[PDB]
Amino acid sequence: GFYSMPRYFQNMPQVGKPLKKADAANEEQLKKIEEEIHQLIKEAQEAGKADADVNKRGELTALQRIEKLVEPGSWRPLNTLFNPQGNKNGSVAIVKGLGRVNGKWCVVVASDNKKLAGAWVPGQAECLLRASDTAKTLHVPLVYVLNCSGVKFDEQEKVYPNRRGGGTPFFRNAELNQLGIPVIVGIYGTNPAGGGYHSISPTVIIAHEKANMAVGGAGIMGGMNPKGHVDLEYANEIADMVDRTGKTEPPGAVDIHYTETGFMREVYASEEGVLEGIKKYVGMLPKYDPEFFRVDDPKAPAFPADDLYSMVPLNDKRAYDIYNVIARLFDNSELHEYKKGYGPEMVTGLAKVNGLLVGVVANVQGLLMNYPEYKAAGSVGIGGKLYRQGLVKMNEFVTLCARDRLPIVWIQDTTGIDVGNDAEKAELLGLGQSLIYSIQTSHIPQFEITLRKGTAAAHYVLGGPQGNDTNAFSIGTAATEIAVMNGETAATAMYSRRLAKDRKAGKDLQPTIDKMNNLIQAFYTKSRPKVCAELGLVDEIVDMNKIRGYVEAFTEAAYQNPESICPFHQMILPRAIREFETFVKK
Amino acid sequence: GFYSMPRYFQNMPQVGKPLKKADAANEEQLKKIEEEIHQLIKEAQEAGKADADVNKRGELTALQRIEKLVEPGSWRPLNTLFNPQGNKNGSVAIVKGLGRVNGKWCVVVASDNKKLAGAWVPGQAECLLRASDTAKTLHVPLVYVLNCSGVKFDEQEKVYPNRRGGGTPFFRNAELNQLGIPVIVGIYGTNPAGGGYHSISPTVIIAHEKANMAVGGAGIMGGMNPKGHVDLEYANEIADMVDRTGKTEPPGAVDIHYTETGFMREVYASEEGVLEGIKKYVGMLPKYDPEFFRVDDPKAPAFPADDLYSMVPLNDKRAYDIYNVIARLFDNSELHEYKKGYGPEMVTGLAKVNGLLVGVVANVQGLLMNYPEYKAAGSVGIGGKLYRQGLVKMNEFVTLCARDRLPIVWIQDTTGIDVGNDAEKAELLGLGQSLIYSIQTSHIPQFEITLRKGTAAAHYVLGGPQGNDTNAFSIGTAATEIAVMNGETAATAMYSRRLAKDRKAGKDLQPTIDKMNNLIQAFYTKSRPKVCAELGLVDEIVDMNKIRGYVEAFTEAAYQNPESICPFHQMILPRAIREFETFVKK
């Protein structure tokens, strides 16, 4: 209840406005898209062995385990639709998300036992690497709810080998430990080879009484597996062998890894027990009481989140007030802008999330009168584009946030960076990379929300996911669309030369027109939210009224156990903001 | 010469044996495989616009530029066959390798201007991230010979966005700079957007007089609002603009980024001039005279490299003497083993590469009598497998090399870690991960050679490519085979249950038998050297007599400008080696 510098952090300026005219059409269009995403998630998650078949055997599913593991309502799904290599079931066979486990925000990864008992499938490794990366970026525990059969022989060369294959997570788990970031695992079922390493690499190993973990299974080792080719005779030996064996406890069961090696620290008889074990050890981990880093009491935004269904236009040709979005994602709709008026194409300011201080960077939409300065008077700027002042302001803002150890939330809706030789002379290329440099050297956790458009290099520089060390993860919405550039712009850039040549040659232009339209169509299809999630362009498409939940999870996680601290009374950004407001060059 | 501790580092024991009789069959089969690789390389590199046409107008190709950039004979090709997403031309449109530029080993990346003028294609980003990672791991300069026209629009969603897309290298170039690792670029042709950032992100920028770099293309239709569709009227408008505009210089040309902004430090009229500019600045970069870290004068191996064509059996059933390989890759065939006799399945010892000290770890093949110690007496161990002592020896060895700041060269030919509860109780699962932990916390550059077999978790723990921070890169040979396990074993393990169950239900077993044979066949096909290269399982398949060349480049690169130093007289590994051989615990 007592915080540092109330005059600077409490009762900051408020922004945004009340929703007067509800836009029924926009809302239903956004919800239709959200609904389709939910339907896609639903089927990806339920694909494979049925819950009933899993439960009949007294075993829980990944979603059921997570439900009993995390604090009610703290689950923040991540990569649900991630399927970079297009597996038919639309899944990567793991359920991941951010969730609070016994008081701590954790990155949670649960093997999906409905799918080949948690076998490794194409794209899974990449999903796991993003998981450890998120944990490393935010310095929060990585929790595994393991039930992994390992490599899927069927697509072996796609999941077993390579620099970023199934073995990479084991080095990442060692790195996390070495960085002082605990990895906690609760294991179920059989976990040989890859599963075995997923079992042994964590910091603390909790096991279900019927689980096992091992280097390998030994199999049948009948070396003399015929000449090489499998025949009926040989087949009639494997079957026999199977008969001459029936049940057989796999290597590395509790009698081995608990009683003998002591690798398993604790064993539980029930599925719920295992989860209780995870909670117990996650509870022993370090964290700062959130109050320590608060500058104000937690406060809900001053406007309903649902208003966004009307205020965020799905039609990318319609502009809107970015402040309405900010007003609905941050505490009490408060925002104290840094250098307002300078670099009007962007909003850079200080805001709060459950009392925690963070920096905010978002595109401003609409016309920008008599702008930019490096163009002739009378020129008009376009909201969504980046110019010189906006790039300079952001460079300074990120650098100040970095010094003050403040996390940054980036909200993207951009059509790119200004082009042409006026822009080039105004150093936009140098300034764009300077921002990338500023971000890369910041050492502060960051979150990126591609509200609508994510295009060209602006998508990179605006705290894009391309900054793997600083961006914990990114989300999108029903209004999201990501592409290199506008399809038509690309189409004309790719064929303009041919159009002129063919016309001067008296050649038909229709075929070139068809290709241009097909390309434009392809750009549209491959830029939809659905595809963004599937390829991982965003780690999750989030419902308009679920966005603040992610901002909250990110920020609380960012402040859960920071590696570095800047005392509030020693922060410069708050003072620089005040200073720019009052100082007049006279 | 004058070196530290001659008694420890000079005249170390020698290993290997002379080649009595050459194995003609083995040699021809190995060479046949190498020839196919070379032919695949020739095809991928030549693909696209013919050299004659590129040269018709004074322009040089990537390979021609590299030949004039690097010191003759120092080129070490990397990822020549890398094509993870299977582009039809078998290329990712870049020519990469390690090469000496004005006295310094550098990771060199050149835009392949024969392919869509160096456009970004699926898989390129990953190839570029490996490039910056190698430079980061070895702490050597990254050199770009840029000629990047842009993006292959019809696959833009595969190359433009995402966490590891075309924009990621811009953050990686910022990181390299921040880590004190220079990035130098010589630019040719038009470089808008992505190519623009590849031009501006480096430390030093050199440009050809006709080259340009920009945040993005000016776009023929100026600041005209994009169109959702293309009709004939619009087509003519485009044709009208190209004609109206006629011959127009792209934005960001020399008159802009040299004369005005000064982003281009130097401009050269000829293609060769640009390369001279690169050499000029790379020459200004820091490096240690190799003599500083040498402990002996460079000496070639005591045996001919070509013997490897007879001594390295293509037949994975034939054993061989790993000392013959070691004897032909390291200086004067010298090797001073660490704890020889303990953990006989592995060789861990000190060796020299052009006088530079390095650690060597390699699998021993053949039968290991009265081993392992945790099994009944008289049992026999299998060379190529990993047991308790081998794993403990390697953990200690790696940890000692790390303390002494010595690079490590791993030579793999393994069938995995021993399995079964005896092995489990001997802690092989814990020891395997311990080794991964030892490697991850080492902070020393490492090189991995998959001589033949790279399988199971052993592939991971034996300095596997999966250790992204420490492994600079990996190579293979014509004898290489990489897979989760042997096909037959996988097939039986995957269909053992369906065989016994289908037979009982009185069902045809032929369908399942066919699947097994298809699986076995797939395993073989997908584990061949060329596939290892195409997927990146190895960064390059190297000829038997070209292996030492990479060992040399790696070691010299590693000692070129080290971040940490351990004086020779302060190294413990040399002492630990001696003590183990003389101490008799009375």
- B166 within 8 A of B129, measured Cβ to Cβ: no
- A445 within 8 A of A407, measured Cβ to Cβ: yes
- B530 within 8 A of B288, measured Cβ to Cβ: no
Task: Residue B290: count other Cβ atoms within 10 Å of its Cβ.
Answer: 15
Under the phi-then-psi rule, with left for phi > 0, alpha for psi from -120 to 50, and beta for the rest, what region is A463?
left
| Elucidation technique | X-ray
Q: Say yes or no for a CB contact (<8 Å) between B457 and A218.
A: no
Q: What share of chain A is helix, strand, coil (3-state, %, to 5)?
A: 40, 15, 45
**Selected residue of A484, A514, A518, A530 to mutate for chain B interface (largest B Cβ count, 10 A):** A484
How far is the C-alpha of B244 from the C-alpha of A529, rounded, in Å? 39
What are residue B204's DSSP bridge partners?
B184
Query: In this structure, what are the phi and psi dihedrals at residue A414, rounded to the nearest 5 degrees?
Result: -135, 150
How far is the C-alpha of B373 from the C-alpha of B370, rounded, in Å? 7
Give the strands of the sheet with A142-146, arranged side by side: A76-78, A94-101, A104-111, A142-146, A183-187, A204-208, A266-268
Q: Would strands B204-208 and B212-214 be described as parallel, antiparallel, or unpaired?
A: unpaired
How far is the C-alpha of B375 from the C-alpha of B370, rounded, in Å? 9
**CATH of span B59-287:** 3.90.226.10
**Selected residue of A79, A85, A128, A162 to mutate for chain B interface (largest B Cβ count, 10 A):** A162
Q: Where are the beta strands (DSSP E) in B283-422?
A: 336-337, 346-353, 356-363, 367-368, 381-382, 385-386, 408-412, 416-417
Q: Select the CATH number that applies to the domain covering B1-58 from these four: 1.20.1250.20, 2.60.40.10, 1.10.760.10, 1.20.5.680.
A: 1.20.5.680
Q: Say yes or no for a CB contact (<8 Å) between A201 and B436.
A: yes
The amino acid sitting at B430 is G
Q: Which residues of B touch A213 (CB under 8 A)?
A: 429
Q: Which among A533, A403, A517, A417 is positioned nearest to A480, based on CA atoms?
A: A533
How far is the C-alpha of A109 from the C-alpha of B59, rounded, in Å? 52
Q: How close is the nearest chain B Cα to the Cα of A295, in Å?
A: 33
Under the phi-then-psi rule, with left for phi > 0, alpha for psi from -120 to 50, and beta for the rest, what region is A562?
beta
Q: Which residues of B touch A499 (CB under 8 A)?
A: 235, 238-239, 242
Q: Which residues of A308-317 are buried (b: 16+ CB within 10 A; e: fewer)?
A: bbbbbbbeee
A231, A235, A535: residue with CB nearest B162 = A535
- A439 within 8 A of A446, measured Cβ to Cβ: yes
Four-residue CA torsion sign, A80, A81, A82, A87: positive
Query: In this structure, what are the phi and psi dihedrals at residue B574, rounded to the nearest 5 degrees?
Result: -60, -40
Element containing residue B390 per DSSP (H, E): helix B388-403
Q: Say yes or no for a CB contact (<8 Å) between A492 and B238.
A: yes
Q: How close is the nearest chain B Cα to the Cα of A329, in Å?
A: 25
Secondary structure (3-state) at B370: coil
| Helix A168-178 / helix B428-440 crossing angle, nearest 10 deg | 70
Alpha helix ranges (H) inside B47-192: 51-56, 62-69, 124-138, 156-159, 168-178
A228, two tokens: 């090489």
Q: Say yes or no for a CB contact (<8 Å) between B242 and A499.
A: yes
Q: Would strands B356-363 and B346-353 be described as parallel, antiparallel, or unpaired?
A: antiparallel
Alpha helix ranges (H) inside A179-269: 194-200, 232-243, 254-257
- Give the residue from chain A lying closest to B524, CA to CA: A157
Q: Would strands A367-368 and B346-353 be described as parallel, antiparallel, or unpaired?
A: unpaired
B220, B427, B492: residue with CB nearest A493 = B220
Dihedral angle, C-alpha B51, B56, B60, B61, nearest 10 °: -20
Residue identified by tokens 């300079």 is A392
- B417 within 8 A of A148, measured Cβ to Cβ: no
Show the CA angle centred on residue B445, arms to residues B180 and B382, nearest 5°: 165
Catalogue the active-site residues of B: 151, 194, 417, 457
Element containing residue B575 per DSSP (H, E): helix B573-582
A273, two tokens: 């027990």
- Give the residue from chain B lying closest to A512, CA to CA: B235
B460, B500, B535: residue with CB nearest A157 = B535
- A49 within 8 A of A78, measured Cβ to Cβ: no
**Residue A154 vs residues A159, A192, A215, A567: alpha-carbon distances, Å:** 10, 17, 20, 55
Class of domain B288-586: alpha beta
DSSP code per residue over A350-366 = EEEETTEEEEEEEEPPS
Domain residue limits, chain B: 1-58, 59-287, 288-586
Task: Residue A244: count other Cβ atoms within 10 Å of its Cβ.
Answer: 7
Q: Which among B189, B152, B146 is positioned nearest to B169, based on CA atoms?
A: B146
Four-residue CA torsion sign, A545, A547, A553, A556: negative
Largest CA distance in chain A: 98
A173, two tokens: 């788990």
- B119 within 8 A of B152, measured Cβ to Cβ: yes
Q: Would strands A540-541 and B76-78 be described as parallel, antiparallel, or unpaired?
A: unpaired
- B128 within 8 A of B92, measured Cβ to Cβ: no
Q: Which residues of B touch A536 (CB under 8 A)?
A: 162-163
Element containing residue A412 per DSSP (H, E): strand A408-412
Q: Where are the beta strands (DSSP E) in B287-407?
A: 336-337, 346-353, 356-363, 367-368, 381-382, 385-386
Q: How close is the nearest chain B Cα to the Cα of A538, in Å?
A: 7
Query: In this structure, what are the phi and psi dihedrals at residue B435, rounded to the nearest 5 degrees?
Result: -65, -40
Alpha helix ranges (H) inside B113-231: 124-138, 156-159, 168-178, 194-200
Q: Which among A499, A482, A501, A494 is positioned nearest to A518, based on CA atoms?
A: A494
Q: Which among B483, B466, B463, B482 is positioned nearest to B554, based on CA atoms?
A: B463
Q: Where are the beta strands (DSSP E) in A117-224?
A: 119-120, 142-146, 150-151, 183-187, 190-192, 204-208, 212-214
**Residue A411 vs residues A360, A446, B16: alpha-carbon distances, Å:** 8, 11, 63
- A333 within 8 A of A14, measured Cβ to Cβ: yes
- B520 within 8 A of B486, measured Cβ to Cβ: no
How far is the C-alpha of A316 from the C-alpha of A74, rounded, in Å? 32
Q: Say yes or no for a CB contact (<8 Å) between B457 and A193.
A: yes
Q: Which among A138, A62, A55 is positioned nearest to A104, based on CA atoms?
A: A138
| Cβ partners under 8 Å of residue A228, min gap 6 | B488, B520
Q: Which among A229, A233, A236 is positioned nearest to B503, based on CA atoms?
A: A236
Give the strands of the sheet with B76-78, arranged side by side: B76-78, B94-101, B104-111, B142-146, B183-187, B204-208, B266-268
Q: Which among B548, B571, B52, B128 is positioned nearest to B298, based on CA atoms?
A: B548
Residue identified by tokens 């009948």 is A222
CA Rg value for chain B: 27
Q: Which residues of A touch B532 (CB under 8 A)?
A: 161
How far is the C-alpha of A441 from the C-alpha of A422, rounded, in Å? 29
The answer, yes or no, to whether the previous bond of B304 is cis (omega within 30 of 0) is no
How far is the C-alpha of A301 from the C-alpha of A265, rounded, in Å? 44
How far is the C-alpha of A184 from the C-alpha of A264, rounded, in Å? 12
Count how many residues are written for chain A.
586
Four-residue CA torsion sign, B237, B242, B248, B252: positive
- Per DSSP, B253 falls in state B
B250, two tokens: 């792209």
Catalogue the active-site residues of A: 151, 194, 417, 457
- Per DSSP, B539 falls in state S
DSSP code per residue over A261-292 = S--S-EEESSHHHHHHHHHHHHHTS----GGG
| Cβ partners under 8 Å of residue A296, min gap 6 | A3, A9, A10, A331, A352, A355
**Selected residue of A121, A133, A144, A170 to mutate for chain B interface (largest B Cβ count, 10 A):** A170
**Residue B41 vs residues B75, B95, B153, B332: alpha-carbon distances, Å:** 15, 11, 26, 32
- Per DSSP, A307 falls in state G
The answer, yes or no, to whether the previous bond of A122 is cis (omega within 30 of 0) is no
Q: Which among B294, B292, B282, B250 is positioned nearest to B117, based on CA atoms?
A: B250
How far is the C-alpha of A478 from the C-alpha of A314, rounded, in Å? 8
**Residue B22 vs residues B15, B30, B307, B311, B313: alpha-carbon distances, Å:** 19, 13, 7, 8, 12
- Per DSSP, B69 falls in state H
- B362 within 8 A of B325, measured Cβ to Cβ: yes
Secondary structure (3-state) at A170: helix
How far is the C-alpha of A254 from the C-alpha of A208, rounded, in Å? 8
| Helix A232-243 / helix B510-525 crossing angle, nearest 10 deg | 100
What are residue A408's DSSP bridge partners?
A359, A446
CA Rg value for chain A: 27
- B281 within 8 A of B206, measured Cβ to Cβ: yes
Query: In this structure, what are the phi and psi dihedrals at residue B58, rounded to the nearest 5 degrees?
Result: 60, 0
Q: Would strands A336-337 and A266-268 be described as parallel, antiparallel, or unpaired?
A: unpaired
Query: In this structure, what are the phi and psi dihedrals at residue B214, rounded to the nearest 5 degrees?
Result: -150, 155
Secondary structure (3-state) at B398: helix
Q: Which among B477, B469, B445, B394 is positioned nearest to B553, based on CA atoms?
A: B445
Alpha helix ranges (H) inside B139-252: 156-159, 168-178, 194-200, 232-245
Q: Say yes or no for a CB contact (<8 Å) between B424 and A214.
A: yes
Q: How close is the nearest chain A Cα to the Cα of B290, in Å?
A: 30
**Selected residue of B315, B388, B466, B470 to mutate for chain A interface (largest A Cβ count, 10 A):** B466
Q: Say yes or no for a CB contact (<8 Å) between B164 and A468.
A: yes
- B190 within 8 A of B223, measured Cβ to Cβ: no
CATH topology match: B1-58 vs B59-287:
no
How far is the C-alpha of B528 from the C-alpha of B533, rounded, in Å? 9
- B101 within 8 A of B109, measured Cβ to Cβ: no
Element containing residue B396 per DSSP (H, E): helix B388-403
Q: Which residues of A touch B433 (CB under 8 A)?
A: 170, 174, 197, 200-201
Q: Would strands B346-353 and B336-337 be described as parallel, antiparallel, or unpaired?
A: antiparallel
Secondary structure (3-state) at A174: helix
| Helix B487-504 / helix B510-525 crossing angle, nearest 10 deg | 170
Secondary structure (3-state) at A310: helix
A208, two tokens: 């279900």
- A314 within 8 A of A18, measured Cβ to Cβ: no
Q: Which among B204, B209, B177, B208 is positioned nearest to B283, based on CA atoms?
A: B204
Q: What share of chain B is helix, strand, coil (3-state, %, to 5)?
A: 40, 15, 40
Under the phi-then-psi rule, with left for phi > 0, alpha for psi from -120 to 50, and beta for the rest, what region is A187?
beta
How far is the C-alpha of A518 from the C-alpha of A252, rounded, in Å? 56
A167, A201, A424: residue with CB nearest B256 = A424
Residue identified by tokens 């719920």 is A272
Query: In this structure, what are the phi and psi dihedrals at residue A321, rounded to the nearest 5 degrees?
Result: -95, 110
